Amino acid sequence: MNTLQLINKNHPLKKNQEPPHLVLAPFSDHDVYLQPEVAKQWERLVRATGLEKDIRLVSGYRTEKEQRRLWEYSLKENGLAYTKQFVALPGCSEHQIGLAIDVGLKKQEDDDLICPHFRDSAAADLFMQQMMNYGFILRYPEDKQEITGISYEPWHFRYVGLPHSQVITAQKWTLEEYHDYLAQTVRQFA
Amino acid sequence: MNTLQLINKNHPLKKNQEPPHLVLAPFSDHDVYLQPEVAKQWERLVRATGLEKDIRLVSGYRTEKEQRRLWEYSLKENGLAYTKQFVALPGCSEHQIGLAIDVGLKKQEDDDLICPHFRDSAAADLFMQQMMNYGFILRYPEDKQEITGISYEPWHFRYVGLPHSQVITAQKWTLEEYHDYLAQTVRQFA
Ligand SMILES: [Cl-]
Ligand SMILES: [Cl-]
Ligand SMILES: [Cl-]
Ligand SMILES: [Cl-]
Ligand SMILES: [Cl-]
Ligand SMILES: [Cl-]
Ligand SMILES: [Cu+2]
Ligand SMILES: [Cu+2]
Ligand SMILES: [Mg+2]
């Protein structure tokens, strides 16, 4: 239930953690599933930006087995080096808690894993202006690979909710940096 | 492993039946999973027809929960009448065995996600002329609603493999009629 939960290579998904409730998300060519609050905020964000005809939900919730099959597919498709840069290991993906979304342009053949498209597009620029106001952050920003362990991905967004998304974005932080900031702040009251 | 398995209202998926092996399917924005054999033939089909740019893979394998979320979304958004005609009940969908695909055109706006636009195109016409040569049948043909329990779905295709797909298509049969045909045929040898 913790919308701030940190999931990466060093902090894998809890095996004792209960699977989140999921609903079918709107504005998607495929059947994408997300947590209710995330799906609702995603819909509000699209309608508020007027991007119903320009952006689409490419990916959402993925099970550990689906994340594994994705990783294996990328391995044969793009190699080990590229896969490790853009695809998280099974159990270390925030897609597995239904808080992560992959966004792509409405017109497109290839997803940004193949031939990057979303970056610096008209739809992206307007999306980047309001996304933090609806609980979303850019999960893997540019020049942050050292901290996140993942290369720059302008199409991957993470729901953390308000006002966390506004705070993180304004400081140009990552979720890792946000947790370190929170950890340090708590120790001041100790 | 039984590509001819009949799944409908009258013949629900056994709850103790193990899920099929699954791989990520191409031409699906890295989001749709299918039976390995199905994904292979799906790839060979779209490659031979040269529709890589024209058509997309909307949906494939869906768990019972995912089928439920799909049903509940449709009911809330489109109403009961619409949902009955085009959405199979949870536990009675052939998407749950990874042999069913929902195909849509990359070439059109909007969603109509439950009934993807796949009819008025020349790409659709070409698809309908070669699909049976790669193991696929049109699962819910026109004027077959009384037999299938599902309205006309030009977007939904079922993998049965060769030569079953050719036999069924040539006779313009449904999977239900095919099973009745096999049943009557076997009893001639009794
Ligand atoms: Cl699964
Ligand atoms: Cl390699
Ligand atoms: Cl860390
Ligand atoms: Cl598997
Ligand atoms: Cl009909
Ligand atoms: Cl029957
Ligand atoms: Cu992602
Ligand atoms: Cu279907
Ligand atoms: Mg799934």
PDB file of C-alpha atoms in Angstrom, chain A residues 4-5 18 23 25-26 37 42 55 65 70 75 81-82 97 99 104 108-109 164 167-168 170:
ATOM      1  CA  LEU A   4       6.667   5.303  -2.076  1.00  0.00           C
ATOM      2  CA  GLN A   5       8.074   1.802  -1.983  1.00  0.00           C
ATOM      3  CA  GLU A  18       0.760  -8.928  -0.889  1.00  0.00           C
ATOM      4  CA  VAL A  23      -8.120  -2.518 -12.672  1.00  0.00           C
ATOM      5  CA  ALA A  25      -6.554   1.184 -17.394  1.00  0.00           C
ATOM      6  CA  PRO A  26      -8.086   3.523 -20.007  1.00  0.00           C
ATOM      7  CA  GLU A  37      -5.608   5.112  -7.767  1.00  0.00           C
ATOM      8  CA  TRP A  42      -3.477   8.528 -15.248  1.00  0.00           C
ATOM      9  CA  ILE A  55      -0.308   9.367 -25.999  1.00  0.00           C
ATOM     10  CA  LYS A  65       7.047 -14.359 -14.709  1.00  0.00           C
ATOM     11  CA  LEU A  70      10.329  -9.719 -21.089  1.00  0.00           C
ATOM     12  CA  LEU A  75      18.229 -10.737 -24.356  1.00  0.00           C
ATOM     13  CA  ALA A  81      24.443  -5.324 -22.403  1.00  0.00           C
ATOM     14  CA  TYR A  82      21.404  -3.426 -23.675  1.00  0.00           C
ATOM     15  CA  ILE A  97       3.487  -3.462  -7.895  1.00  0.00           C
ATOM     16  CA  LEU A  99       2.693   1.689  -9.801  1.00  0.00           C
ATOM     17  CA  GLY A 104       4.360   5.714 -25.968  1.00  0.00           C
ATOM     18  CA  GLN A 108       4.299   4.253 -33.778  1.00  0.00           C
ATOM     19  CA  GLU A 109       5.523   0.813 -34.846  1.00  0.00           C
ATOM     20  CA  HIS A 164       5.759  13.514  -3.321  1.00  0.00           C
ATOM     21  CA  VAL A 167       8.745  17.541  -4.387  1.00  0.00           C
ATOM     22  CA  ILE A 168      10.871  15.003  -6.271  1.00  0.00           C
ATOM     23  CA  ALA A 170      11.151  20.182  -8.362  1.00  0.00           C
TER      24      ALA A 170
END
